């Protein structure tokens, strides 16, 4: 075909805090490798760094990446170019309209990857708060990704290797525990795992 194809047709989500850096790097990579992927953040608001630590640029979820881009450009185009935010926002715009909050989505997934335990917990808490009415299993997996541009890309590679492995399973529910441990031993990373239900 014209594109790579996931034989398991997994529906995947990747989740971070602001749906800006880590989840979007993973979104882009996963999509290019042919996966059905969506991305979200778990924070109350979208938060990008500013010119001072105590002066973040904060927006509501739903604010178009394009508008955040314009906002920072007029603030100080050169500063937000050198620190990488304008490129990040540009990459994001090409993927989708705006940052989305996981707790507000109605989409369902076979696998949800989170990029730090705080996000993992919010995702799991949110899933548990919902009365399951289908008994459709979903696997939440946490893979720690350090929050900067370089490590976000590295995380995208690692997360993609993990999803690729699980996609090759013909019965994920009965294989996944063993596959997670194999991945942990080979890649020397801890994966947090929960099985929840829609």
């Amino acid at each position: 075909g014209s594109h790579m194809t996931d034989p398991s047709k997994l529906a995947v989500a990747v989740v971070d805090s602001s749906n800006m850096n880590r989840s979007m790097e993973a979104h882009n990579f996963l999509a290019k490798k042919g996966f059905n992927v969506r991305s979200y953040g778990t924070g109350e608001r979208v938060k990008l760094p500013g010119m001072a630590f105590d002066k973040p640029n904060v927006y509501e979820f739903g604010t178009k990446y394009e508008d955040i881009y314009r906002d920072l450009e007029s603030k100080d185009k050169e500063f937000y170019t050198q620190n990488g935010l304008l490129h990040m926002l540009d990459r994001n715009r090409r993927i989708k309209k705006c940052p989305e909050r996981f707790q507000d989505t109605k989409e369902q997934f076979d696998i949800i990857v989170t990029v730090e335990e705080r996000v993992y917990d919010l995702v799991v808490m949110h899933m548990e708060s919902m009365e399951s009415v289908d008994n459709r299993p979903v696997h939440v997996l946490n893979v720690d990704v350090v929050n900067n541009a370089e490590d976000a890309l590295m995380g995208a590679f690692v997360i993609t290797d993990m999803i690729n492995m699980m996609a090759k399973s013909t019965d994920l529910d009965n294989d996944i525990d063993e596959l997670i441990q194999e991945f942990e031993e080979r890649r020397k990373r801890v994966i947090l795992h929960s099985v929840l239900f829609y």
Binding site: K47, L48, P49, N147, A149
Partner: peptide
């Protein structure tokens, strides 16, 4: 925490 982290 911001995305990315403040540098």
């Amino acid at each position: 925490p911001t995305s990315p982290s403040y540098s």
